[PDB]
Design a protein around this ligand. Structure first.
Ligand SMILES: *[C@@H]1O[C@H](CO)[C@@H](O[C@@H]2O[C@H](CO)[C@@H](O[C@@H]3O[C@H](CO[C@H]4O[C@H](CO)[C@@H](O)[C@H](O[C@H]5O[C@H](CO)[C@@H](O)[C@H](O)[C@@H]5O[C@H]5O[C@H](CO)[C@@H](O)[C@H](O)[C@@H]5O)[C@@H]4O)[C@@H](O)[C@H](O[C@H]4O[C@H](CO)[C@@H](O)[C@H](O)[C@@H]4O[C@H]4O[C@H](CO)[C@@H](O)[C@H](O)[C@@H]4O)[C@@H]3O)[C@H](O)[C@H]2NC(C)=O)[C@H](O)[C@H]1NC(C)=O
Ligand SMILES: O=C1c2cnc(N[C@@H]3Cc4ccc(Cl)cc4C3)nc2CN1C1COC1
Ligand SMILES: [Ca+2]
Ligand SMILES: [Ca+2]
Ligand SMILES: [Cl-]
Ligand code: NA
Ligand code: NA
Ligand SMILES: [Zn+2]
Length: 804
């Protein structure tokens, strides 16, 4: 109930929301059906439109007018945005030469540069180039300010997930808005775009920027606008708030446009009908910038132009139907479209089996336009699993396609020509970032980055301490002229042991054998120097990783590689090796095929054993440093040490062997040498974070050898590939992956073919940021470079995407 009998007299777009049953006059009252009777009359004036004309200049103030051209309007803070242009012979902001803003130029009483976020729905990255002719205001922001060629959204590339990620710095799995549509089984409640449940506070986790601001005594404008409030009125409301007295005036504001998404859905991303939407957004930006210029704030305010996601070509004819795969289609609920989420229709149906559904949806049709996953098997880069609102069964849908349950769902609902929601590495899903103002750099291009990073920066721009989030604070310092955040490197928690030779061969009863009984003062001292780390400078280029948790581990040095060996997990946390452009691949000799060798530096009781692998009929083993890249026949024996061995399913060993035999050398050839750090990952609770030992659900049978969920590699080289990896003077280049350790290759529909036709495709799907691996391992990499720390943070957030 609302008592709509109150009045918005003097309360229009009030910042403090009053509570029921008192009637509301804020920019959301409409969305709750709660506005006072007179809100439209007083607050949504339209008379005479949005522009001054010659004839209105110096008019008698008529309070019925939507905006004013009277002499008192600047002082009232309610001129039309073009008032000074039409009436005072000023120029439009866009017509002004762009001049560097070295310092804030703010009116008296402004404590800090205000931040205005100009957010645009469905604004595809390539619109900045392809639409440049019809977007002069936006192109001046872009060219004179700081811009990225694109910004990467989060998965799924839907509106509420991405806007709330922008607001919080969190992955959707953490903030709780994991889709446009959701069922929470704990609440027994459904979130939808239509209706009132979505307003319930229990859906919305984390702490959005407007709350972070308020709590730290920075006042905020309200970020959400009721759909019926026209854009011109949104802009005028913002400009009015900026004329409030200092004690009352917000420091942070958001504008939102439903365009170009709205038209994009109807016409497709590049439909001829898309030009006018882009012109209209640009005019709105023009209005803002002209309005700021009038208020003398155009060289004071920091303005962010940012999108939530892009737009792809999608038609009703490109729909896959689960009814063409499942017999049992009526026993499931599907969340459909550009992703699929599947659960049981009834929790009383005990005949529901996810295993049988996945199998019926796996590599069934030659050109199949979706791939089923258990959510914990999704690429770790998507960070899309650790929430009860994310169904166990997920369908990754190919770009340009939809999935639906049955055909009748499509036509008893072609209409639409665009959609979004796909994998966030897809080029069509990428969106835009521009920053303009005193705190941003001048005419600066920055590399693409992820929208999870922005919250931190908005906090920096406002002098706020960010709530804990999934950004890496300092990774975007290169966007900023001032207000940079200068972090220290985390302190190492666990110092390594450096074991010498402590055990005789006969002390080991591992059930391993090696044909290595083959016998020199010249070379005898040489191998001693290798085991004490005489080659470690070559193989450990950026310092040893720091272990950021309490554990017991040993540094082991070798001719060709160095490792940090966990006495707890009985395997390396990391193995580091450098492969030059000139390096030769060799085979595993016939006589050494099944060779495993005790490591006389490590006690039997902290070693793996071969008998456990013999008895475990499902589990085999591989090596972290590859025997194929041994520098000499004698050095190759090091590669068969029990301390280099890790558990691997035979199916995964196909993937691993091809990576180690073919791809590493390929990358060294292409990149002028590479440094590789490989190791295991344990994430059995799919939270993106390093497991403790008590969270491991699977061991090699009859043993305490824990089974990794994933294997990682970090592959670093010189950005200037005219320098070799091991003698790089300048910035680095990295690519990484986190490969799921699976007992089958069902994910790869062409896996019965040669590894040359599918393995590298798998690895590209499982591309990762170094930062992803840090979370999953509790390691901190790149501790000892000649690079600034902020630059290294940027490197650690880089994702190699493999798009054109
Ligand atoms: C991305 O960044 C985020 C933010 O930094 C990272 O997420 C954090 O990770 C931490 C570890 O997983 C986690 O810390 C825990 O906090 C528990 C209390 O959490 C509440 O309080 C915070 C602060 O206000 C709040 O933000 C939380 O919000 C979550 O939950 C609500 C609803 O419940 C949602 O509205 C919201 O979206 C959010 O959901 C997400 O997080 C939860 C986890 O809390 C997930 O389950 C969801 O799926 C979703 O992802 C909470 O309201 C605290 O209780 C924990 O302490 C336990 O563990 C320690 C271990 O030492 C132990 O000593 C304690 O005893 C305790 O265990 C006890 O409870 C166990 C389980 O009930 C039980 O088994 C034991 O026997 C014990 O009784 C812990 O400290 C933090 O909550 C989140 N924060 C957020 C915002 O998500 C995230 O990791 C980053 N991602 C990556 C990849 O890096
Ligand atoms: O009706 C609306 C609506 C209204 N206002 C908004 N404001 C945006 C929320 C937000 C968050 C972070 C940042 Cl940095 C800027 C902004 C501004 N957003 C929306 C989204 N939406 C529906 C269309 O898809 C859901
Ligand atoms: Ca959107
Ligand atoms: Ca974990
Ligand atoms: Cl969804
Ligand atoms: Na075996
Ligand atoms: Na297969
Ligand atoms: Zn949309």
């Amino acid at each position: 109930w609302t008592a709509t009998s109150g009045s918005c007299k003097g309360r229009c777009f009030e910042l403090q929301e009053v509570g029921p049953p008192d009637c509301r006059c804020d920019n959301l009252c409409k969305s709750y059906s709660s506005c006072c009777h007179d809100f439209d009359e007083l607050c949504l004036k339209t008379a005479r439109g949005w522009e001054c004309t010659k004839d209105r200049c110096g008019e008698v103030r008529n309070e019925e007018n939507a905006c004013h051209c009277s002499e008192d309007c600047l002082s009232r803070g309610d001129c039309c945005t073009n008032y000074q242009v039409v009436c005072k012979g000023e120029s439009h902001w866009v017509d002004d030469d762009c001049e560097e803003i070295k310092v804030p130029e703010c009116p008296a009483g402004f404590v800090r540069p205000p931040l205005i976020i100009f957010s645009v729905d469905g604004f595809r990255a390539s619109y900045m180039k392809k639409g440049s002719k019809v977007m002069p205001n936006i192109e001046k922001l872009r060219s004179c300010g700081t811009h990225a060629p694109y910004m990467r959204p989060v998965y799924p590339t839907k509106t509420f997930p991405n806007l709330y990620t922008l607001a919080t710095g969190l992955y959707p799995e953490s903030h709780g808005i994991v889709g446009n549509s959701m069922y929470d089984p704990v609440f027994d409640a459904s979130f939808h775009l239509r209706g009132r449940e979505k307003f319930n506070h229990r859906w919305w986790g984390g702490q959005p920027l407007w709350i972070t601001a308020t709590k730290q005594g920075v006042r905020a404008g309200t970020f959400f606008w009721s759909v019926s409030i026209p854009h011109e009125r949104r802009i005028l409301t913002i400009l009015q708030w900026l004329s409030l007295p200092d004690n009352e005036r917000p420091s942070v504001y958001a504008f939102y446009s439903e365009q170009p998404d709205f038209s994009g859905h109807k016409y497709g991303p590049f439909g001829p009908e898309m030009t006018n939407p882009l012109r209209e957004i640009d005019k709105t930006v023009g209005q803002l910038m002209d309005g700021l210029k009038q208020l003398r704030l155009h060289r004071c305010v920091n303005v962010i132009f940012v999108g939530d996601h892009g737009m792809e070509d999608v038609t009703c004819d490109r729909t896959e139907f689960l009814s063409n795969y499942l017999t049992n289609v009526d026993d499931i609920t599907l969340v459909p479209g550009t992703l699929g989420r599947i659960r049981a229709k009834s929790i009383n149906n005990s005949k529901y089996d996810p295993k049988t559904i996945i199998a019926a949806l796996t590599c069934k049709k030659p050109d199949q336009h979706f791939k089923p996953y258990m959510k914990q098997h999704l690429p770790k880069r998507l960070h899309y699993a650790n929430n009860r609102r994310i169904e166990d069964i997920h369908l990754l849908v190919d770009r340009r396609w939809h999935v639906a349950r049955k055909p009748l769902d499509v036509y008893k609902k072609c209409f639409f020509q665009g959609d979004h929601g796909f994998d966030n590495k897809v080029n069509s899903m990428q969106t835009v970032f521009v920053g303009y103002g005193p705190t941003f750099k001048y005419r600066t291009k920055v590399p693409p980055f992820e929208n999870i990073e922005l919250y931190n920066v908005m906090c920096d721009l406002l002098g706020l301490k960010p709530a804990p989030n999934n950004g890496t604070h300092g990774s975007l310092n290169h966007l900023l002229r001032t207000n940079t955040f200068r972090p220290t490197m985390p302190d190492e928690v666990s110092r390594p042991n450096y074991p010498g030779i402590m055990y005789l061969q006969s002390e080991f009863d591992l059930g391993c054998t090696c044909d290595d009984k083959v016998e020199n003062k010249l070379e005898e001292l040489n191998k001693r120097l290798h085991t004490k780390g005489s080659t470690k400078e070559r193989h450990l280029l950026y310092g040893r990783p720091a272990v950021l948790y309490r554990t017991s581990y040993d540094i082991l040095y070798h001719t060709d590689f160095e490792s940090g060996y966990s006495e707890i997990f009985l395997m390396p946390l990391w193995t580091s090796y450098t492969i030059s452009k000139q390096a030769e691949v060799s085979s595993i000799p016939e006589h050494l095929t099944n060779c495993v060798r005790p490591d006389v530096r490590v006690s039997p009781g902290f070693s793996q054993n071969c008998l456990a692998y013999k008895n475990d009929k499902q589990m085999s083993y591989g090596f972290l440093f590859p025997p194929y890249l041994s520098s000499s026949p004698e050095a190759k024996y090091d590669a068969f040490l029990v301390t280099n061995m890790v558990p691997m399913y035979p199916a995964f060993k196909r993937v691993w062997a091809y990576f180690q035999r073919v791809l590493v050398k390929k990358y060294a050839s292409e990149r002028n040498g590479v440094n590789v750090i490989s190791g295991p990952i344990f994430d059995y609770n799919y939270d993106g974070l390093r497991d403790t030992e008590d969270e491991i659900k699977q061991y090699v049978e009859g043993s305490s050898i824990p089974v990794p969920t994933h294997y990682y590699s970090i592959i670093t080289s010189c950005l200037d590939f005219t320098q070799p990896a091991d003698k790089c003077d300048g910035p680095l280049s990295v690519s990484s992956f986190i490969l799921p350790h699976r007992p089958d290759n069902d994910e790869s529909c062409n896996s019965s073919e040669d590894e040359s036709k599918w393995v590298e495709e798998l690895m590209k799907m499982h591309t990762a940021r170094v930062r992803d691996i840090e979370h999953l391992t509790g390691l901190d990499f790149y501790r000892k470079t000649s690079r600034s720390y902020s630059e290294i943070l940027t490197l650690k957030t880089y994702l190699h995407t493999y798009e054109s």
